[PDB]
Amino acid sequence: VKNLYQSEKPQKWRVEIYSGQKKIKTVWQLSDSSPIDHLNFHKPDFSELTLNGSLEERIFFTNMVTCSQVHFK
Amino acid sequence: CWLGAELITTNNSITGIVLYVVSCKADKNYSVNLENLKNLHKKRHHLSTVTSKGFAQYELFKSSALDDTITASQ
Amino acid sequence: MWERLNCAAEDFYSRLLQKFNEEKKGIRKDPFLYEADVQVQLISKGQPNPLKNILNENDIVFIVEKVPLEKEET
Amino acid sequence: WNDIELLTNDDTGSGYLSVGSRKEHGTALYQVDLLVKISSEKASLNPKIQACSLSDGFIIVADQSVILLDSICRSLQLHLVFDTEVDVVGLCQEGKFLLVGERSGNLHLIHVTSKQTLLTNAFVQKANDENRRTYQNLVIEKDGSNEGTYYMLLLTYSGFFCITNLQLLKIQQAIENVDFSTAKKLQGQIKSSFISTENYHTLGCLSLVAGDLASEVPVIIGGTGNCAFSKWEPDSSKKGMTVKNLIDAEIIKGAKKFQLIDNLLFVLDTDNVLSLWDIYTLTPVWNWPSLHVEEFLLTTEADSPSSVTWQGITNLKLIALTASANKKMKNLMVYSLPTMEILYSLEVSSVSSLVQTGISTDTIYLLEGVCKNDPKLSEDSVSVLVLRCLTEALPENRLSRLLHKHRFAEAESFAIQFGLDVELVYKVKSNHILEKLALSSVDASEQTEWQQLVDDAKENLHKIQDDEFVVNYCLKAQWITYETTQEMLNYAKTRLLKKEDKTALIYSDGLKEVLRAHAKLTTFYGAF
Amino acid sequence: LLGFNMIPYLRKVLKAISSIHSLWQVPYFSKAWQRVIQIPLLSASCPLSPDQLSDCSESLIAVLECPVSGDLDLIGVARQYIQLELPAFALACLMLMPHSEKRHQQIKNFLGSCDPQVILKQLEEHMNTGQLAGFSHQIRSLILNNIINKKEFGILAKTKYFQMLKMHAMNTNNITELVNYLANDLSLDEASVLITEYSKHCGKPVPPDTAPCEILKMFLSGLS
């Protein structure tokens, strides 16, 4: 199925950099759609905007999962 | 958009916690250095090694309908 | 500032532990109302997990959300 | 304050000036030394004292007399008496330039070695109050984009001055090479930009801290008003700093003092409560509400800013000025982060200030107000200013700051001097070099980097006579090549076999783990 | 037990106690392994009967099952297998040493005196059966890697293993020298098909209907 994802763009691409356990991680992810189920970032209002042979504008959603490690002793 | 809190468990003992801070950006341009991300991971939590796992979701097929979808089954 | 922090944290820990005990006994319930505008849902495998959109490594996790507000009547 | 007397470490065990009713509880490893003793002809009822110990020198700010000594505090460099009370001080250009910020709003650039007020500028023409300070913090930092140039953050009651183009190295050159016309021309080229915090800090900014993390310049300002915290970062597309993060005055109404060691923003609130914060996103990491710390000072044997990262959480010994139940007496505690174990307790007068030291000082400096023994004078009235130096001359107290800050070179000599355990220094250096070996991978350009560390680790293991520690280090060593791993496991097995030939084969955990590692030695090669 | 010459019973007892850490340090443990391994090998001689070959396999298993086999003289056992005309069995014992430099020297000196095709045939016929199947492929990987490193593609080129020598170039990414040998010393068709298969394997397929010289040119430009 290598010919199926070499002709399609990924709906989400994620890189996860971690050390040892996956409790502490840094994630950089790019999604063509909104990856948030409780918020919606402002896409341009396609009313009175481009309605011709030109393609519609697309805003890619990039999300950065960071964290802060606290030592409990 | 999300605030996470995951405990660091060593031998089923709470030796720490991971306070996740998930941010989201809406920008047409996407470009970042992997070395910069690895350095940020090394310098923010003061760990030694870095390993990068890659994930990708390629949507192959979605059931199309002659109307906006309401039914959960798809 | 003293009781409203420590006592609240302990009460929240007790509510979470009660939710785990209910989940492990085979009884899945609605997201319990810890506060008026806050409800906490213990999403496990068998329930939809929004965090899978950003992190595939979270399977059994509490999601704290605002209570879904219903429309007002006259 | 004009009567200056400079005393050395040999004058400490021959006389003291202090107020009675002092109780000390703790180990005798802490030594209090009397370095500087400044007596005044008039006993100030409530002097507004301040002291800062920079690498360029030591500044004592009295009501109106500024005393500038060297970092050792044994020679008199400068003594300036002004008619306006000085609020903030700061040294620059190896201590050859003094910036005096008077209460009226005038900044004086004065050459230290010539006693000449080279420049005087009224940066603010409005004196808000002659009893409360106008300038709050004076932070001088070295520019990384221009050679011989400084950038300077002046926190004011209505905002902050970002002053760049401080080409003070060339000003000093034009002082040495005698041409004062060019010196004045360069002084007139200084670029000052005021950024107002009147839209976010409506009650005046209290404290300012500046750092360099995440390839940015996080300037955290803590004040009272609409927003307690304001995080300013320089805009790469413009000339100035913009707000990046805001914390509302809901939980914490403001910050009185900051201290940023590394990725740790120790925030003192308006309630004299210390807390631990992560500067990356300003999340609550720790809080210290039990200790009413009026002022906190963090002192450690600093060798490099990256030394704290790799050795846990013992980095700093918190010197906290706790307010005890006595309304005449403050209590200096030494705590071990974060367990708050009382390592040292000293009773200090009501007028006593922790010296605002940098991240380059190794000793603790305290400005103490000692009143002369006179029943006609109250204890609050300070007649003598005494510089108290807290030195942990006895071992196992400086050694804690030695082994943590990756200072094995000095720690070896420290252990030799007191006849301590030198092998433990090698044991810690072995773990550090073990992680340094993990600082490399299978690359076509890093071959020599890990190879030299292999020899360093071999030398350290040869210097460590404890066989079990060497075997465990070998078993837990992270290697990048199979050849080296096999060779070092063979060496570990051989060392265990050699010692068992004379002890009738004493069973040890090292041999049991080495054998099972060898069982997985060939399995990993054949499988992956 | 060895005093009564019960070599197989002693082997069974040793393998029964090969899971206890206390008995691994018996002074006779490694001594018992060595004689039990060698006595059936010393008694055996060419030609190899099925019982003698099974006993050689049992000795190799005892080498495998021994947790302290690194303390045994594996060069001696390998030379005993050489006297049995079993280069594959000798290389199996040579590979299991815990010393890396001596192992590399001995393997390089050994494989340069034995025909790789015969060793691979012995690996296929006997080493791929029983419990030795998983280690035969690793011996084969060592042999093929040494062949590629020694520019000895011509030994297996006339046999059926050359195509196999092709696919091992796929898995270990050691195709540069094989491609050079095929393009220079042999026909360009085998080099072009080899590079096409390599491109298909790595997810960067070369488009078809391409001349072998052009495919070689893109392969050479792909190595820079």
Swiss-Prot record, chain C:
- The secretion signal range is none
Native source species: Homo sapiens (Human)
Q: How does it assemble?
A: Component of the RZZ complex composed of KNTC1/ROD, ZW10 and ZWILCH; in the complex interacts directly with KNTC1/ROD.
Q: Which gene underlies this protein?
A: ZWILCH
What function does the entry list?
Answer: Essential component of the mitotic checkpoint, which prevents cells from prematurely exiting mitosis. Required for the assembly of the dynein-dynactin and MAD1-MAD2 complexes onto kinetochores. Its function related to the spindle assembly machinery is proposed to depend on its association in the mitotic RZZ complex.
Which family does the UniProt entry place this protein in? Belongs to the ZWILCH family.
Compartment(s): Chromosome, Centromere, Kinetochore
Any further remarks? ZWILCH gene is deleted in a patient suffering from colorectal cancer with chromosomal instability.
- What's the protein here called? Protein zwilch homolog
UniProtKB/Swiss-Prot annotation, chain D:
Sites where Phosphothreonine occurs are at 12
Q: Where on the tree of life does the source sit, at the highest rank?
A: Eukaryota
- State its location(s): Cytoplasm; Nucleus; Chromosome, Centromere, Kinetochore; Cytoplasm, Cytoskeleton, Spindle
Where the protein is mainly located, per its record? cytoplasm
What are its GO cellular component terms? actin cytoskeleton; cytoplasm; cytosol; kinetochore microtubule; nucleus; plasma membrane; RZZ complex; spindle pole
Cell division as a keyword of this entry, yes or no, is yes
Q: In which tissues is it expressed?
A: High expression in testis.
GO BP annotations of the record are: cell division; mitotic sister chromatid segregation; mitotic spindle assembly checkpoint signaling; protein localization to kinetochore involved in kinetochore assembly; protein-containing complex assembly; regulation of attachment of spindle microtubules to kinetochore; regulation of exit from mitosis
Entry keywords, A to Z: Cell cycle, Cell division, Centromere, Chromosome, Cytoplasm, Cytoskeleton, Kinetochore, Mitosis, Nucleus, Phosphoprotein
Record has Cell division as a keyword: yes
- Phosphoserine, modified sites: 14
GO MF terms here are: small GTPase binding
Q: What does this protein do?
A: Essential component of the mitotic checkpoint, which prevents cells from prematurely exiting mitosis. Required for the assembly of the dynein-dynactin and MAD1-MAD2 complexes onto kinetochores. Its function related to the spindle assembly machinery is proposed to depend on its association in the mitotic RZZ complex.
Q: How does it assemble?
A: Interacts with ZW10; the interaction is required for stable association with the kinetochore. Component of the RZZ complex composed of KNTC1/ROD, ZW10 and ZWILCH; in the complex interacts directly with ZWILCH.
Q: What is the name of this protein?
A: Kinetochore-associated protein 1
Species source reads: Homo sapiens
**What gene is this protein a product of?**
KNTC1
Q: Which residues of the full protein are shown?
A: 2 to 529 of 2209
Curated annotation (Swiss-Prot), chain E:
* Quaternary structure and interacting proteins, as annotated: Interacts with ZW10; the interaction is required for stable association with the kinetochore. Component of the RZZ complex composed of KNTC1/ROD, ZW10 and ZWILCH; in the complex interacts directly with ZWILCH.
Q: What does this protein do?
A: Essential component of the mitotic checkpoint, which prevents cells from prematurely exiting mitosis. Required for the assembly of the dynein-dynactin and MAD1-MAD2 complexes onto kinetochores. Its function related to the spindle assembly machinery is proposed to depend on its association in the mitotic RZZ complex.
The name on file for this protein is Kinetochore-associated protein 1
The chain's disulfide connectivity reads none
Specify the species.
Homo sapiens (Human)
Compartments reported by the entry: Cytoplasm; Nucleus; Chromosome, Centromere, Kinetochore; Cytoplasm, Cytoskeleton, Spindle
Its tissue distribution reads: High expression in testis.
What does the record give as the organism's lineage?
Eukaryota, Metazoa, Chordata, Craniata, Vertebrata
